[PDB]
C-alpha cells in the first residue's frame, strides 16, 4: 500500500466510532506499522483490543495533560522503535459546562485554559518530545473542526481552542519544514454517531449538515481515515501547513435553503 | 465629531508610544468621554496625566491575570459610569524566552498558557464582566496581528494566542450581537518604535515591510487611532465580528521582491 | 466633516433605493465635493436631480462596455476637476437568465463574458483611464458580495465575477499604492428593498439573514454608506487591498439555526 | 491502484514538463484508464507519443476557445467512453503582453476577457458539455496558483481570471454535488521548468520559493501528479469544492527572511 515502510503512531482512540480507529483501520489498510496510545485505564483494555486486531503489539499510556507522561511514553516507544514516521493527533477536551449555552455566560478562566491545553497545546508538546526521533520525510496530523473558522452555537471555546491548534499547525509546520517533517490538519465535518455526544444539540447540527451539504450526506471515519492515511503518506510530500476540509463541501456553500 | 456622546473605556495605555494612547487621542478629538485603566503601579502616574490631557479623571486599576481585579474596576467605573458604550482592549503578554528562535523547541506550557491567558482569555473576561452595563448600540474592540494567520518567525506562540483572539471576536460577536453589541479587531501592521522590542528581530521586520508595504510605509498609531475610532462608532454600525487588516496591503501582497 | 475638500466621483446611481445614493449621501454630509455617472438617456434626468439635491452639477454620461465612453467621460470631468480624489465604482450586470438555477445549467459562455466585463473589467477600466489626474492619498473603492467566496443560490455566475473583482482590489491596491492611491472594497449584505430583484429568490434569501445575521437585522444603504464615505477618507489612510464585510456578522457565523 | 476502474479525460498535455503529463502518469501508475486531448495540429503527434506511452489510443482534439469544439470532443469521447468518470483541466491563457510590468498599464479589455474566458469559463463548459456522461461518483479538477489570492508582480490579470475559476470550482461544486460529483482545485506552487514562461521573472519567483517554503524546496510534477490522482480518487470521497495547496507550506508563512 502507500504507507508501507511507515511507522506511525495514532493517539485518541476510545471507541470503534472515535476518528482515530477509522484513521488506523485505514493506514493499516496501505501498510503501515502502527502504534497506539490510551488516556487512562479505563481504556487499555479495549485500545489493547483493535492494537491486536491491527497486528500492534504496541499499546502505550499517555496523557497529554502531563509532560511527564508524554516523555515517559516516548522514552518507552523508543525502546522498539528508536526512530518513526510521525503521529496522529485526534485528542480534545473541555468541561461539559463549556459546551452548552451563551458563550459569553459559559465560558470560564478554566474552561478556557483547559480547552486551549488539552485541545491545542498537546499536539507541539507531542512533537517536542519526539523531534529527534522523526525521521526525515516524517508528517504529523491533527483533526479540526469548522468551528474555528466561524462562530457556531454551543461550540463555544473549543471554537478558540481549534483556531489555537490551526495556527500552531502552520507554526510548526513552518518550524520542522527545513529537518523533513511536515504537519497538516484536517478539519472534519460532523461525523454521525449514535453515541452521546458533550457538544449541545449536536443531533440537530448533523441534521442540517446532511441536508445542506453539497455532497449530500455527512462523511464517515473511512472519508476522514482515507485523508489521513494520503496526508501522512509520501503521496502528499508537496503539502504542509494546511488544514484540509474533509466536510463534503459544506463550509464552502451558504444558504442552501 | 462621530464619537460625541459615547462613553468608552481604553485599557493598555503605558506610554505616548502605546496603541493605546493613539486610540485615546483620536477617540478624544471625535468627541468621546474616556476612562482609563492600568496594570499596576509602575504606570499608574502616567496613565494619571495622559488621562487629564484628555480630559478624563477616571484612571482604575485592572490586572486581566485576575478575575477579582476586573470585577473590582467594574463596580468602581459603575460608580461614575452606571451604563457605558464599550471598551478598547490593547493588551497582550508572553514571557520573554518565548519569543526567540525555534518555535517547537522556544514553547513551553506554561508559556502557551499565560500567552493565551493574557492575550485572548482577558477580552472575553471583560465582556463578562461588564456586559450588564453595555448600552445598545455598544462595540468592543481588541488588537490583533499577522502572525494569527501566517507563521512568522519569532513571533511564535504569540501566533497562536491571538488566532484564538480573533476566533473570541467571532464567538463574542455572535453571541452579543442581538443585545446590540458589536465586536470586531483591528490586525495591525508592525508600527515603528525607537523603543525596544520584545519580538526578537522586530527591527528587520519593520524595515522589510516598509519595502514591500502597497503603500510603501508603516502605519502608525494615528492610522490605527483613526480606523478604531470609526470602529467604535455609530458609522460602523452594520460591521461586526470583523478583522480588519490596518497594515497598509502588506497581507495581500506576495513577493514584492 | 471628515470629507471636506475632497473631490469625488460617484457611479450608478439609478434610484433613491441604489447602494450609491446612500454612498453620495453620507459623502455629502461629511463635506466631499461630488460628481455623478450616469449609464444611459433614461437616467439622466434621476441622476440630476438628486445630483442638484445634493449640490452637484457634474453630471456625465458613462457606459463601462465602452472605453470610449470612460475617456470621453474623463475628458469632461477634467474640464472642472483636472486632479481628483478618486471614485465610487457601484455598478454591477449579468442578463436575466444567468441567475435563476443551476449554475451548470444556467451559465453561457456569453453571459459568463458580459458578467465579468461589465462587473469586474470596468472598474481598472476606470482606474487606467484616470490614473493621472488622481490627488496622492486618493481612494478607490468598489461593491461586492459574499457570493465571491461562497456558492450561493442563484447568485450563479456573478459570484464567479465578484470573485475576480475582489481580486481586482488586491492587484490594484498593489500597483497604485506606490503613488499613493489607495483601493478596497465593501462586501455589503443583502438589502431590503420594495423594488424587485433579478436574482432569483431574493426575498427568502433577506429573511433568511435577518433570522441569522449576528446583530439580526439586514444592513442599510446608510450602513454601507457610512463605511464607504470612512473608506474613503483619509481616516482609513493605512487601510487598503482591503475586503471590508459590511453584513452585520453574517459571514463569520454558522448555523445560527 | 486506488484509480483502479476509473476512466479519466486528461486536458493540457503539451510536453513531459507539463503538469498534465505529471498527473496522466501517477493516475496511470494507480490503474486509471486514460483519454486525451490536444489543442492542436503542432501538439497532435507529441500526445499521441505520450498516450501510447500510457497505454491509451483516444487521443482526441480540443480547443476550449471553441463550443463546437468541446461538443465535438465529448460526441467522440462518447464513442467509446459512453460513461466516464470525470476530467482534469489544466489549461490556461493570456496574450504575453499580459504579463508584464503594472497591472494597470498592461490590462487590457480583450486581454482581460480572453484570460477569464480560456482560463476559467472553459472549466464550467467542459462540465456542462459532458455532465449527462459522468458516472456517480465521479470528480473534476483544475490546477490554480496562488495568484487568485494575492497581488503578485507580473502575474497581472491572470490572478483574476484564476480567482474566478476557484469560485467556479465552488460554484460548480455545490451545483453537481447532490448528483454524485465532486469538483475541486489544488493550487500548486511554481514548477522548476527549464522551458522558458511567459511570466516575467518567473525564475526569481522560483529561486526565493525555494529559499522560503516550509520545505525548501519546490514541488514537481510527480508531487501535483501524486495530490491530483488522489484527489480524483474514491479515496477523497469526503473532499468536495476546496482548494488544495500543493506548494510545499509556502502560502502559510510569512517574512522568512
Ligand atoms: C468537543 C470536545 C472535545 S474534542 O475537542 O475531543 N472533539 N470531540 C468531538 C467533536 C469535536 C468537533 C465535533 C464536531 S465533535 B471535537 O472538538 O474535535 C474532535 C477531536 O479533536 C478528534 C477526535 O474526536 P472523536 O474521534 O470524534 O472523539 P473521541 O472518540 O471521543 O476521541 C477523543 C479522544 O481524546 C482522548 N483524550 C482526551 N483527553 C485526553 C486524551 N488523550 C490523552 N490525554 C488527555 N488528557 C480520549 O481518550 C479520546 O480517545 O476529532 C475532532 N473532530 C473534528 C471534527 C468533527 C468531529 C466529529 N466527531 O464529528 C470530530
Ligand atoms: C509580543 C507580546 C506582547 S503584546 O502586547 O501581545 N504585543 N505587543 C507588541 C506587539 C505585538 C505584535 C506586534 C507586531 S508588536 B503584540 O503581539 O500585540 C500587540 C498588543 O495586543 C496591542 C497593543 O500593544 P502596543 O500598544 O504595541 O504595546 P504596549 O504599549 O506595550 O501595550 C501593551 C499593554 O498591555 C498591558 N498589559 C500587559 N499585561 C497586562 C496588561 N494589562 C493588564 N493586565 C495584565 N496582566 C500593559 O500594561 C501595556 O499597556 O497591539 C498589538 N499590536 C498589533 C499589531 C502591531 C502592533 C505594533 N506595536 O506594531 C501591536
Ligand atoms: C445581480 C447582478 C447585478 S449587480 O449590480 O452586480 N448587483 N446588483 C444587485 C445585487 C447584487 C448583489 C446582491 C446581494 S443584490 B449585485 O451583484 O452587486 C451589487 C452592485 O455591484 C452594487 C450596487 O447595486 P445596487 O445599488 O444594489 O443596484 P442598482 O441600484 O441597480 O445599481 C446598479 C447600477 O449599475 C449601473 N450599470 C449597469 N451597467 C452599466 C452601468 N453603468 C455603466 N455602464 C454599464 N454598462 C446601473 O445604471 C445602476 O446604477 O452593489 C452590489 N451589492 C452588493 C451587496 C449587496 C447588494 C444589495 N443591493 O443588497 C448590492
Ligand atoms: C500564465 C498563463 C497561462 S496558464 O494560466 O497556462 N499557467 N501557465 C503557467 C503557469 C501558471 C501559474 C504559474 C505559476 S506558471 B498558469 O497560470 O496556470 C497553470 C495552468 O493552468 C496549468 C497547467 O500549466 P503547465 O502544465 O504549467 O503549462 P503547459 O504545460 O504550458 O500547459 C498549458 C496547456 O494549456 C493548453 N491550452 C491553452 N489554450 C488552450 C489549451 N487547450 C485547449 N484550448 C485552448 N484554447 C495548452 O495546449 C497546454 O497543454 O497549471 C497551472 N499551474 C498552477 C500553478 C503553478 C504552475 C507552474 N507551472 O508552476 C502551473
Chains 1, 2, 3, 4 share one sequence.
Not at 489498510?29 to 486486531?53: C, I, M, P, S, W
Request: proline share 3%; hydrophobic share 45%; charged share 20%.
Amino acid at each position: 500500500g502507500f504507507l508501507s515502510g511507515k511507522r506511525i503512531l495514532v493517539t485518541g482512540v476510545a471507541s470503534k466510532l472515535s476518528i482515530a480507529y477509522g484513521i488506523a483501520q485505514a493506514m493499516h489498510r496501505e501498510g503501515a506499522e502502527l502504534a497506539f496510545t490510551y488516556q487512562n485505564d479505563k481504556l487499555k483494555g479495549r485500545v489493547e483490543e483493535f492494537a491486536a486486531q491491527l497486528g500492534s503489539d504496541i499499546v502505550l499510556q499517555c496523557d497529554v495533560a502531563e509532560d511527564a507522561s508524554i516523555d515517559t511514553m516516548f522514552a518507552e516507544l523508543g525502546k522498539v522503535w528508536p526512530k518513526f514516521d510521525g503521529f496522529v493527533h485526534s485528542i480534545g477536551f473541555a468541561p461539559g459546562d463549556q459546551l452548552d449555552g451563551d458563550y459569553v455566560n459559559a465560558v470560564t478562566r478554566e474552561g478556557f485554559k483547559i480547552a486551549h491545553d488539552i485541545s491545542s497545546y498537546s499536539f507541539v508538546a507531542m512533537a517536542k518530545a519526539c523531534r529527534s526521533m522523526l525521521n526525515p520525510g516524517s508528517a504529523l496530523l491533527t483533526l479540526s473542526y469548522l468551528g474555528a473558522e466561524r462562530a457556531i452555537p454551543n461550540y463555544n471555546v473549543m471554537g478558540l481552542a481549534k483556531a489555537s491548534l490551526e495556527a500552531n499547525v502552520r507554526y510548526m509546520a513552518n518550524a520542522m519544514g527545513p529537518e523533513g517533517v511536515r504537519v497538516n490538519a484536517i478539519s472534519a465535518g460532523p461525523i454521525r454517531t449514535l453515541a452521546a455526544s458533550g457538544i449541545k444539540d449536536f443531533r440537530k447540527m448533523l441534521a442540517h449538515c446532511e441536508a445542506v451539504t453539497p455532497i449530500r450526506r455527512t462523511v464517515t471515519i473511512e472519508d476522514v481515515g482515507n485523508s489521513a492515511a494520503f496526508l501522512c503518506s509520501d503521496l502528499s510530500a508537496g503539502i504542509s501547513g494546511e488544514v484540509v476540509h474533509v466536510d463534503g463541501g459544506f463550509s464552502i456553500a451558504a444558504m442552501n435553503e
